[PDB]
mmCIF file of C-alpha atoms and ligand atoms in Angstrom:
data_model
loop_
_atom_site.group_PDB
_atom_site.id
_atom_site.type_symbol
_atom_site.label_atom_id
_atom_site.label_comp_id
_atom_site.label_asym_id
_atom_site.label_seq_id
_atom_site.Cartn_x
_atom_site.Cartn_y
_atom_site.Cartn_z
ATOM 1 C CA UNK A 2 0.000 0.000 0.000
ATOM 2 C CA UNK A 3 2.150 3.040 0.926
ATOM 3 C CA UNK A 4 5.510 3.659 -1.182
ATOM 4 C CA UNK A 5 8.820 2.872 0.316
ATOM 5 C CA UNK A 6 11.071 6.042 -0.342
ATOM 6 C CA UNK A 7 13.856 4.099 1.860
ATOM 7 C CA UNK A 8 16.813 5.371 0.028
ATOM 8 C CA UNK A 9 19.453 2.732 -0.974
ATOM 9 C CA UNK A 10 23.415 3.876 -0.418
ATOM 10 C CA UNK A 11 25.392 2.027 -3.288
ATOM 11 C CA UNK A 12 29.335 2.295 -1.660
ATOM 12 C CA UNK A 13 32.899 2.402 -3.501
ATOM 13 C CA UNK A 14 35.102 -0.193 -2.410
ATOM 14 C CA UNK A 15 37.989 2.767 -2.024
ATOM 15 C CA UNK A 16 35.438 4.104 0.652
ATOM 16 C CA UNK A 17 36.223 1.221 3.329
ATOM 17 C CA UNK A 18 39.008 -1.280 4.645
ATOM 18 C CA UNK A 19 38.563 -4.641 5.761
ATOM 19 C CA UNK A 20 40.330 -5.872 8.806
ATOM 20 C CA UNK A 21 39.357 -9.385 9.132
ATOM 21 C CA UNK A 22 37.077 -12.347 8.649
ATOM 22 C CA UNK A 23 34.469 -13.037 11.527
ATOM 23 C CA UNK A 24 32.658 -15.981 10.148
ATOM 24 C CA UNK A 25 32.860 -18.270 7.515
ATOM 25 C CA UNK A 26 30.608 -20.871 6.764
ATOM 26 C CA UNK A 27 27.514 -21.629 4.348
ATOM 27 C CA UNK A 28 26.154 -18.024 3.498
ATOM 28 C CA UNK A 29 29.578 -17.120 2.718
ATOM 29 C CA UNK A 30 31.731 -14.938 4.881
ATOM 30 C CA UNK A 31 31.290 -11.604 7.449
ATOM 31 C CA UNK A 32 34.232 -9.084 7.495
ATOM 32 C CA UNK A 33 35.161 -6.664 10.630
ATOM 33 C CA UNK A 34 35.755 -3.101 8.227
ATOM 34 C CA UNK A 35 36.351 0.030 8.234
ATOM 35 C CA UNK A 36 34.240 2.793 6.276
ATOM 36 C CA UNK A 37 35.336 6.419 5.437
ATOM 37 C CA UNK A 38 32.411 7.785 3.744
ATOM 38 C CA UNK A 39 33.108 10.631 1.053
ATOM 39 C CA UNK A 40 35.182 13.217 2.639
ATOM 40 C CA UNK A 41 33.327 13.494 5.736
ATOM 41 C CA UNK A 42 35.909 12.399 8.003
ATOM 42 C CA UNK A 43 34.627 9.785 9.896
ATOM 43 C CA UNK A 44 35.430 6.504 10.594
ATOM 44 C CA UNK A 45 32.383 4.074 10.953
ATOM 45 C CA UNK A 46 33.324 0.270 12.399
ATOM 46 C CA UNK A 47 31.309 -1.911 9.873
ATOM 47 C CA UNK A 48 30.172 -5.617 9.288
ATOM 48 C CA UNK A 49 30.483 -6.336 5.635
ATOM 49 C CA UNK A 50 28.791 -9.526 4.232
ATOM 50 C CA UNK A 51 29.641 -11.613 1.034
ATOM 51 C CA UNK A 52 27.352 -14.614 0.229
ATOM 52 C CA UNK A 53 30.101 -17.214 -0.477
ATOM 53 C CA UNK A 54 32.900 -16.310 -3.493
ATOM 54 C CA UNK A 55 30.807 -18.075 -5.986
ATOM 55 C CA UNK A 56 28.468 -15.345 -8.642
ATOM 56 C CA UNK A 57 25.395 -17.787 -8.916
ATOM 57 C CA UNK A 58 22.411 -15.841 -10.404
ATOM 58 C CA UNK A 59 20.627 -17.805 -7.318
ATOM 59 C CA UNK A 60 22.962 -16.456 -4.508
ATOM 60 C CA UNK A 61 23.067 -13.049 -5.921
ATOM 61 C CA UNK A 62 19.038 -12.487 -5.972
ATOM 62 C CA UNK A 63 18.665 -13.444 -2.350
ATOM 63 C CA UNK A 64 21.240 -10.944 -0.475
ATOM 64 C CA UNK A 65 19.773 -8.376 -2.848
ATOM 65 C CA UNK A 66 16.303 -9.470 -1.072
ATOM 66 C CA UNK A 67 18.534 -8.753 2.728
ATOM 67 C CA UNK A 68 19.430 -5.103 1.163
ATOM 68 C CA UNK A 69 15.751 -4.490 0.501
ATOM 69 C CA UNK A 70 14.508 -5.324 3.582
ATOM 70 C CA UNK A 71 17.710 -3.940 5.835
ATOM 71 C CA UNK A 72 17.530 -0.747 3.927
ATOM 72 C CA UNK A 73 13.599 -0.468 4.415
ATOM 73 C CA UNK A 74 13.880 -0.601 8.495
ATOM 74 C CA UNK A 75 14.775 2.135 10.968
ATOM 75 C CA UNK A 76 14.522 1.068 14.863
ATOM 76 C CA UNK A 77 17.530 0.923 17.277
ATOM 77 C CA UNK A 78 16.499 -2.873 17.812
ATOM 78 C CA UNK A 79 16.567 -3.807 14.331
ATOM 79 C CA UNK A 80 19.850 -3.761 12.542
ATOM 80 C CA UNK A 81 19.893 -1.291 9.374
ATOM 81 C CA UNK A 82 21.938 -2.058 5.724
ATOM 82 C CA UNK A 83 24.019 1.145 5.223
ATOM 83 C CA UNK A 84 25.192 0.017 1.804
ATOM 84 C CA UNK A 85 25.722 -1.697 -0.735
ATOM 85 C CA UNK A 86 28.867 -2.862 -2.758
ATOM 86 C CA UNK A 87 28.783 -3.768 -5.943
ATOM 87 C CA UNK A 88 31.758 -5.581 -6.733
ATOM 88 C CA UNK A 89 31.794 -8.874 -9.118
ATOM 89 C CA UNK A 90 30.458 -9.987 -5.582
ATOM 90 C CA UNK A 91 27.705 -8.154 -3.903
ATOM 91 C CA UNK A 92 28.729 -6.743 -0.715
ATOM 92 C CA UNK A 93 26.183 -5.588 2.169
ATOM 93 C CA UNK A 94 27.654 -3.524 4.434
ATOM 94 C CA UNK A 95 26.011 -2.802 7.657
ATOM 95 C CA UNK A 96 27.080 -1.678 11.407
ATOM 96 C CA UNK A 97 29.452 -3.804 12.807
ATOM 97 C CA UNK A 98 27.627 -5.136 16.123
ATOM 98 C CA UNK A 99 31.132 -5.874 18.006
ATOM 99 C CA UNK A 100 30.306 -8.473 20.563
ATOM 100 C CA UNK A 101 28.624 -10.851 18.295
ATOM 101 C CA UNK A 102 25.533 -12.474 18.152
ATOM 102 C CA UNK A 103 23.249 -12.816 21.313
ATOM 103 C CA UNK A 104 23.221 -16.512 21.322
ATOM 104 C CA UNK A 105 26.951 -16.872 21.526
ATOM 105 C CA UNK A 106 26.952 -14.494 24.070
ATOM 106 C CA UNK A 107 25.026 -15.480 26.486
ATOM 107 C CA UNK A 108 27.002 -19.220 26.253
ATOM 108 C CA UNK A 109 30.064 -17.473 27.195
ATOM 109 C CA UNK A 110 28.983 -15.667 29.712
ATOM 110 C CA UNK A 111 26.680 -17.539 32.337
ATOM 111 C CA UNK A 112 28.163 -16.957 34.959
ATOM 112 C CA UNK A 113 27.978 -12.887 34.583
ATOM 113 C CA UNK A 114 24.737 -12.405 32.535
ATOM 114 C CA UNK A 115 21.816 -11.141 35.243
ATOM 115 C CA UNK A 116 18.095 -10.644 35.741
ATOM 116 C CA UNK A 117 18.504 -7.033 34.631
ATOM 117 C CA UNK A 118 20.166 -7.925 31.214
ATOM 118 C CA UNK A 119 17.838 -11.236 30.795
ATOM 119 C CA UNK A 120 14.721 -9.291 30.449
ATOM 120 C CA UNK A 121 16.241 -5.916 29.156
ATOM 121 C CA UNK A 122 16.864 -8.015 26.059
ATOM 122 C CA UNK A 123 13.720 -9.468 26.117
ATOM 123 C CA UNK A 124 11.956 -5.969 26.371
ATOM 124 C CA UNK A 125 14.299 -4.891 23.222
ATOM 125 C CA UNK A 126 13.551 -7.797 20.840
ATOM 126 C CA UNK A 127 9.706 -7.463 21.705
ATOM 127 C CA UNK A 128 10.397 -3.910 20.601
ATOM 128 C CA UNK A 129 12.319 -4.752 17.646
ATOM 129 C CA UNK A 130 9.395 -7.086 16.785
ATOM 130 C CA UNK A 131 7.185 -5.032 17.289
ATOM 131 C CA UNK A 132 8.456 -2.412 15.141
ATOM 132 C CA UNK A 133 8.854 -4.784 12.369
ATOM 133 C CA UNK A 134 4.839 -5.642 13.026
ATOM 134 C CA UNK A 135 4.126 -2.136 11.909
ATOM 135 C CA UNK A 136 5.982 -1.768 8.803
ATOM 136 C CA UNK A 137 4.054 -5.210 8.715
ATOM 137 C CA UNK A 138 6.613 -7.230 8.047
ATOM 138 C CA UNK A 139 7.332 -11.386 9.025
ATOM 139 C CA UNK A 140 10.880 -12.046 10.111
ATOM 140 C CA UNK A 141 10.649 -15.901 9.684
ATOM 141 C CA UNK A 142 14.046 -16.521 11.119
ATOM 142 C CA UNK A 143 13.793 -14.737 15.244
ATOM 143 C CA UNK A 144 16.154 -16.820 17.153
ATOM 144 C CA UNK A 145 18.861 -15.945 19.417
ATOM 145 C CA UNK A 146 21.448 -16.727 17.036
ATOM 146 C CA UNK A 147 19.860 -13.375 14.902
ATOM 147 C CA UNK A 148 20.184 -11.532 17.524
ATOM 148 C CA UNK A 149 23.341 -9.093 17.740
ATOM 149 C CA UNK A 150 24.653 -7.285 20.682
ATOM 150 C CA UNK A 151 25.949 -3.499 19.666
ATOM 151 C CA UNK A 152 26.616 -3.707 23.727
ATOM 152 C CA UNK A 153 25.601 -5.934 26.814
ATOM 153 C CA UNK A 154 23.039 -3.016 27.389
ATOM 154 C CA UNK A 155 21.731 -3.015 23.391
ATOM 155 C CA UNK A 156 20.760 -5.578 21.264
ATOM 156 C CA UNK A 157 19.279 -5.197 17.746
ATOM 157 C CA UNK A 158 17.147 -8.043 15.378
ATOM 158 C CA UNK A 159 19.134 -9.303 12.214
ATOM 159 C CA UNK A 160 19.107 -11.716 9.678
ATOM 160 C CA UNK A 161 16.460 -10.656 7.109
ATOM 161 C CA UNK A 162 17.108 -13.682 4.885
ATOM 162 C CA UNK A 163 13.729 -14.780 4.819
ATOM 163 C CA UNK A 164 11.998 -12.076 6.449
ATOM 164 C CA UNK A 165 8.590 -11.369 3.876
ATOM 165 C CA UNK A 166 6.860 -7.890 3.637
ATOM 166 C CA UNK A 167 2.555 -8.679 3.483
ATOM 167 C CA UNK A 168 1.318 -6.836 0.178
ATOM 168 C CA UNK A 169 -2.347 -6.374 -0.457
ATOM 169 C CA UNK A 170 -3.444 -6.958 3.255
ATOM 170 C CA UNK A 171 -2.594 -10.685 2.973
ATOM 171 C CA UNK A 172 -2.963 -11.714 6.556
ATOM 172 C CA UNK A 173 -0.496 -15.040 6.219
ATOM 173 C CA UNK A 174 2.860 -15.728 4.399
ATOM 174 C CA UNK A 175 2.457 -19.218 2.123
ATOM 175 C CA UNK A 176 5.706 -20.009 1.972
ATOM 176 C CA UNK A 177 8.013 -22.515 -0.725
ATOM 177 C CA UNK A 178 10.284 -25.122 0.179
ATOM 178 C CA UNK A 179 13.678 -24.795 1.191
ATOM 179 C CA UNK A 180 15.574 -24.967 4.498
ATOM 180 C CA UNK A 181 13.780 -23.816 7.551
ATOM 181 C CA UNK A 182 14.664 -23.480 11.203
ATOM 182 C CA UNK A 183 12.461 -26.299 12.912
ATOM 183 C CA UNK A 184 12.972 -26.034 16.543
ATOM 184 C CA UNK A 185 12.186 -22.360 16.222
ATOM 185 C CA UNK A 186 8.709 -22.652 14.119
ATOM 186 C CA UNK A 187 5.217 -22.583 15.303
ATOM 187 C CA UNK A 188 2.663 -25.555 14.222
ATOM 188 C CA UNK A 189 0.950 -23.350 11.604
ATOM 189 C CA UNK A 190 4.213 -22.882 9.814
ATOM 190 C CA UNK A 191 5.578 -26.904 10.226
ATOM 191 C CA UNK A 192 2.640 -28.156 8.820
ATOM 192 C CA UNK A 193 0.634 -25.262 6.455
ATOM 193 C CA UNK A 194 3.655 -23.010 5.496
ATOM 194 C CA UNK A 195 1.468 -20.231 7.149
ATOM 195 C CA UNK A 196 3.787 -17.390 8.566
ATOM 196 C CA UNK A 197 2.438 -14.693 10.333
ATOM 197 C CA UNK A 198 3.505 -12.013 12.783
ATOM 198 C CA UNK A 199 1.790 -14.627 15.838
ATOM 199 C CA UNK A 200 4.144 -16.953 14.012
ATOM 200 C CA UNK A 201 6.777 -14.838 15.118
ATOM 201 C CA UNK A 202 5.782 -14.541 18.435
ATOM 202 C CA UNK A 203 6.262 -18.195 18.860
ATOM 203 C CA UNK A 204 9.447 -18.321 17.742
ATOM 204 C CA UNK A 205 10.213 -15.163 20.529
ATOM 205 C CA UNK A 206 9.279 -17.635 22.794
ATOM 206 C CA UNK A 207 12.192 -20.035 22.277
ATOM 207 C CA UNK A 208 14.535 -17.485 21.413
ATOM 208 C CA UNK A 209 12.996 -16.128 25.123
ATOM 209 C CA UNK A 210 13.666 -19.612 26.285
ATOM 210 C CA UNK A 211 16.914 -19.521 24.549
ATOM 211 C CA UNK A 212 18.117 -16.747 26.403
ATOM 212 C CA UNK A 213 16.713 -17.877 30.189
ATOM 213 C CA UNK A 214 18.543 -21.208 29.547
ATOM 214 C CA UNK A 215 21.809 -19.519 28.995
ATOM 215 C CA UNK A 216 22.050 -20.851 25.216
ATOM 216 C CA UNK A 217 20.470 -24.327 25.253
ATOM 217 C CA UNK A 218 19.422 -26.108 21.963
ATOM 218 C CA UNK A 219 15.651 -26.216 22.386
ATOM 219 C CA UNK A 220 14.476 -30.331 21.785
ATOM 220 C CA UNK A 221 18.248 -31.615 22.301
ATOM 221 C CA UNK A 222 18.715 -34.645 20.498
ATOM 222 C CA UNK A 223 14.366 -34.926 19.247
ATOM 223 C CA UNK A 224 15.433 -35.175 15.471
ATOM 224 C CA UNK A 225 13.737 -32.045 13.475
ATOM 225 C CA UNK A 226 10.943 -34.565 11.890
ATOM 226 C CA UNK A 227 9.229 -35.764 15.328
ATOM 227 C CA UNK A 228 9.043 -31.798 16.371
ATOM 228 C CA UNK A 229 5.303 -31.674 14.298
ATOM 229 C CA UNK A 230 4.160 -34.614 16.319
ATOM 230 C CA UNK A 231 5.440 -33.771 20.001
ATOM 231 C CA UNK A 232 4.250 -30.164 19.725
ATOM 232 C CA UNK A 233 0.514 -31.589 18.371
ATOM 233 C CA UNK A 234 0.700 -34.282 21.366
ATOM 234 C CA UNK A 235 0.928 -30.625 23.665
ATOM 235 C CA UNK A 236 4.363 -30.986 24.529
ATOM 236 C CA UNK A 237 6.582 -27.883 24.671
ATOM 237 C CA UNK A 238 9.695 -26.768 25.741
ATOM 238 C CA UNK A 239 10.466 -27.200 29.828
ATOM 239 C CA UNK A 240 10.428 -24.538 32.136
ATOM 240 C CA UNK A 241 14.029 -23.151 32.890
ATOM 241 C CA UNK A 242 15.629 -23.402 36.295
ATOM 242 C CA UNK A 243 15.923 -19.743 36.974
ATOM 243 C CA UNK A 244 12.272 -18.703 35.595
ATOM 244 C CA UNK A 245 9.678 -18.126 38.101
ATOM 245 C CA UNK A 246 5.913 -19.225 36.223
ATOM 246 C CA UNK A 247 5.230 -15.615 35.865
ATOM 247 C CA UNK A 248 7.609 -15.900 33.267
ATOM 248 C CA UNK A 249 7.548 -19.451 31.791
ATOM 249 C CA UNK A 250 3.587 -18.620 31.908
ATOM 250 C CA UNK A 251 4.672 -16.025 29.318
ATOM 251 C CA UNK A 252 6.598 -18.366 26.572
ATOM 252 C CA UNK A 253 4.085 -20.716 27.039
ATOM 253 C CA UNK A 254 1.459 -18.596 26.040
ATOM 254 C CA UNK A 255 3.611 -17.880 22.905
ATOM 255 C CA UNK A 256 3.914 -21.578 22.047
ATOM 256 C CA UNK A 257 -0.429 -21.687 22.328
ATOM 257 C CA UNK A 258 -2.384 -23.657 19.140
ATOM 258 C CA UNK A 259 -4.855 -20.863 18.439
ATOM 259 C CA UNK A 260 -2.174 -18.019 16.932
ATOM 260 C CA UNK A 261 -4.283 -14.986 18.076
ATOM 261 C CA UNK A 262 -4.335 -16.754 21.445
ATOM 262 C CA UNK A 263 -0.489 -15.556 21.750
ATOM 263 C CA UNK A 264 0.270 -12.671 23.097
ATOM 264 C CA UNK A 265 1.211 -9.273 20.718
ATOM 265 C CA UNK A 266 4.680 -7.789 20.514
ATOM 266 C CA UNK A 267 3.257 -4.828 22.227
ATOM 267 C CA UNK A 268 2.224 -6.997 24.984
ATOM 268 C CA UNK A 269 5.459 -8.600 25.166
ATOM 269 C CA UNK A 270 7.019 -5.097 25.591
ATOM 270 C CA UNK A 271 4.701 -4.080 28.500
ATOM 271 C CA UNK A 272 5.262 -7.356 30.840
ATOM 272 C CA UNK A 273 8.517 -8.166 30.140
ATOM 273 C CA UNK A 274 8.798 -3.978 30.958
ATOM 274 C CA UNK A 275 7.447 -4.820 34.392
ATOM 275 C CA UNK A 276 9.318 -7.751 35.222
ATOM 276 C CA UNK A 277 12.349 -5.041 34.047
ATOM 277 C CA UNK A 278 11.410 -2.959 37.354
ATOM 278 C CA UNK A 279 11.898 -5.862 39.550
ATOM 279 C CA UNK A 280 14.205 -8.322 37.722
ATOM 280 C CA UNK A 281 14.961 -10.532 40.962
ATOM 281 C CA UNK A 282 10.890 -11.173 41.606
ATOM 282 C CA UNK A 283 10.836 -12.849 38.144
ATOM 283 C CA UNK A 284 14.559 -14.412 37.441
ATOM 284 C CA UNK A 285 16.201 -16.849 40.482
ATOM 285 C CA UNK A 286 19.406 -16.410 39.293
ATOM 286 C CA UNK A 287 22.243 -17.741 41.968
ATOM 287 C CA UNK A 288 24.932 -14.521 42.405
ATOM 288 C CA UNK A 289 22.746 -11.701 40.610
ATOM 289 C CA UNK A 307 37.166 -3.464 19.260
ATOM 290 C CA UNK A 308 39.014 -0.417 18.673
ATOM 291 C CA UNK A 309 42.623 -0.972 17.424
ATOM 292 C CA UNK A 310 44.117 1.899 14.613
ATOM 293 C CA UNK A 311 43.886 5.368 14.892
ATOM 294 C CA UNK A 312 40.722 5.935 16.335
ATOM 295 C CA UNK A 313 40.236 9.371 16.525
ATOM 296 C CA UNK A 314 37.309 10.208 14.022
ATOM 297 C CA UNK A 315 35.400 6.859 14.994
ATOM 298 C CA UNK A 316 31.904 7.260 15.156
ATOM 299 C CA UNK A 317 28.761 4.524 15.439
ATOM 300 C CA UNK A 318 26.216 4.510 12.729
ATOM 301 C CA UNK A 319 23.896 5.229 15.670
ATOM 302 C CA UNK A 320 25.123 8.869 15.454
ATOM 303 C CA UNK A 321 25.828 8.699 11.761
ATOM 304 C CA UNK A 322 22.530 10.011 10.031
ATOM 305 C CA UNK A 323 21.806 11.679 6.328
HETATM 306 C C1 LIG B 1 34.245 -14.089 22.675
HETATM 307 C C2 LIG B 1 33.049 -14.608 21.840
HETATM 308 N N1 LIG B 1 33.450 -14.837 20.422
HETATM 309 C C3 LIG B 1 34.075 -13.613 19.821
HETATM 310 C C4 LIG B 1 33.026 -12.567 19.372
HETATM 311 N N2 LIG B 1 32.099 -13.170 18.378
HETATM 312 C C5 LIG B 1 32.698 -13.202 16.999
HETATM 313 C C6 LIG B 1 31.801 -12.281 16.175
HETATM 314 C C7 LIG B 1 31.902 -10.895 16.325
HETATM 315 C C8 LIG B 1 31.046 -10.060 15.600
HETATM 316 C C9 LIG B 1 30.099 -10.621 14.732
HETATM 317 C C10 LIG B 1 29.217 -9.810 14.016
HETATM 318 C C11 LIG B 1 28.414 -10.213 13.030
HETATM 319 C C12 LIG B 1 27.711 -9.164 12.615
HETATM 320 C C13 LIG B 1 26.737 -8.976 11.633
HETATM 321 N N3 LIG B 1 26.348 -10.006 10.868
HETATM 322 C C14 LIG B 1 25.055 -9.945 10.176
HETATM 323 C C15 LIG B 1 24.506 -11.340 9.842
HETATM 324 C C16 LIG B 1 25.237 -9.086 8.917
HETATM 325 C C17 LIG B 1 24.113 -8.673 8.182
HETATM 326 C C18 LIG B 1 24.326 -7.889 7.045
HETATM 327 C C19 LIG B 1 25.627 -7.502 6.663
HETATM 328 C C20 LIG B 1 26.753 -7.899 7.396
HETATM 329 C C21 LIG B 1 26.542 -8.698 8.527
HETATM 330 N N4 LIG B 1 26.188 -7.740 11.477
HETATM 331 C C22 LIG B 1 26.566 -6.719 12.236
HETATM 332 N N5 LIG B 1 27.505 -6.878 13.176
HETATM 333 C C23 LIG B 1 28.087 -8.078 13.389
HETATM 334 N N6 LIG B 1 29.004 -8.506 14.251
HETATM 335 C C24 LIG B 1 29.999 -12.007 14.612
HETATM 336 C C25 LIG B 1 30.848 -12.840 15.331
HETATM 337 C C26 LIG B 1 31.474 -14.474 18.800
HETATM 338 C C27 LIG B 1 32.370 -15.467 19.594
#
């Protein structure tokens, strides 16, 4: 319905330095960078991705489909594309978001993560989420591991890989083949291919659940095929050791049959906000990057056009 007037920033390779590789894998690889925009004089740390070496028609399409939707979001929990490259290989180049990605994080740091951060992040990817409900659009892919942490205190949604925008007020995603994230998808989506923004909501509940069990695999071992059946015999995920059932009660409402049974982003944001005034009522938890010339560095928080 309404136009998207989201500029796109097409970047010269002169304009920034790489500095090293940060993961390699399927995809392709993720470069640690430096960018020096025009004359401007300022430095901007920067992730820069590169779907694999290889220039297959297929690859190419998809990270073009990333730029589109990266470029079309502005929230400071939702990571935004500032570029793109457009070498022989198409480069996205986006903020670099030092400390990783939330799911890693949270693994190496058990023993220092508490009830504060817990549901501060939770408050900031309901927001995120939320945010991405207005400019009605369906991640697809909300798990911890798309999570990135800018700082302990700030984490933003990535990973638009699959994320669809609803056209003509269609209510629900139908979706093709291709690999999808299990352990992460509500019932609608395992067995209809219907994706929805309630669909995303359940999948906030494991990355919720995720988080509260300091980085477990949710179903460990229950091989991706059974997950249908045990989530239509009512099973779901167990309760984590440090959650009191005010907040368990809250990812299990996000795992319910009926989608608009499941609570809204914007009622995600206002309980997980109250449980943020008293963390230690709602978490039982036992005990509760620069390196060259930095002089003109600035974040593309403060870098605006
Ligand atoms: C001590 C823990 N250890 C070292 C820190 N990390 C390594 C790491 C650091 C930064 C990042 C990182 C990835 C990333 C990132 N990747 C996304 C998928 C991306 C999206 C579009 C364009 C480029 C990247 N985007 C923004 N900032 C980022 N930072 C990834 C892994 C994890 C494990």
């Amino acid at each position: 319905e309404a136009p998207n007037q989201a500029l796109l920033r097409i970047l010269k390779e002169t304009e920034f330095k790489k500095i090293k590789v940060l993961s390699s894998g399927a995809f392709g690889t993720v470069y640690k960078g430096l960018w020096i925009p025009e004359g401007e004089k300022v430095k901007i740390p920067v992730a820069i991705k590169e779907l694999r070496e290889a220039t297959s028609p297929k690859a190419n399409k998809e990270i073009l489909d990333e730029a589109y939707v990266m470029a079309s979001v502005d929230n400071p929990h939702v990571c935004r594309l500032l570029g793109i490259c457009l070498t022989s290989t198409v480069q996205l180049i986006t903020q670099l978001m030092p400390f990783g990605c939330l799911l890693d994080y949270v693994r190496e740091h058990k023993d220092n993560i508490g009830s504060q951060y817990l549901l501060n992040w939770c408050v900031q990817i309901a927001k995120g989420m939320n945010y991405l409900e207005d400019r009605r659009l369906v991640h697809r892919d909300l798990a911890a591991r798309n999570v990135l942490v800018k700082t302990p205190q700030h984490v933003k949604i990535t990973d638009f890989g699959l994320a669809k925008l609803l056209g003509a007020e269609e209510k629900e995603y139908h979706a093709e083949g291709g690999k999808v994230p299990i352990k992460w998808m509500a019932l609608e989506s395992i067995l209809h291919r219907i994706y929805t923004h309630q669909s995303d909501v359940w999948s906030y509940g494991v990355t919720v659940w995720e988080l509260m069990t300091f980085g477990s695999k949710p179903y460990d071992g229950i091989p991706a095929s059974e997950i249908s059946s045990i989530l239509e015999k009512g099973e779901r995920l167990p309760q984590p050791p440090i959650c009191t059932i005010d907040v368990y009660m809250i990812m299990v409402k996000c795992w319910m049959i009926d989608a608009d049974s499941r609570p809204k982003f914007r009622e995600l944001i206002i309980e997980f906000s109250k449980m943020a005034r008293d963390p230690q009522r709602y978490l039982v938890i036992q005990g509760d990057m620069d390196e060259e010339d930095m002089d003109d560095v600035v974040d593309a928080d403060e870098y605006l056009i």
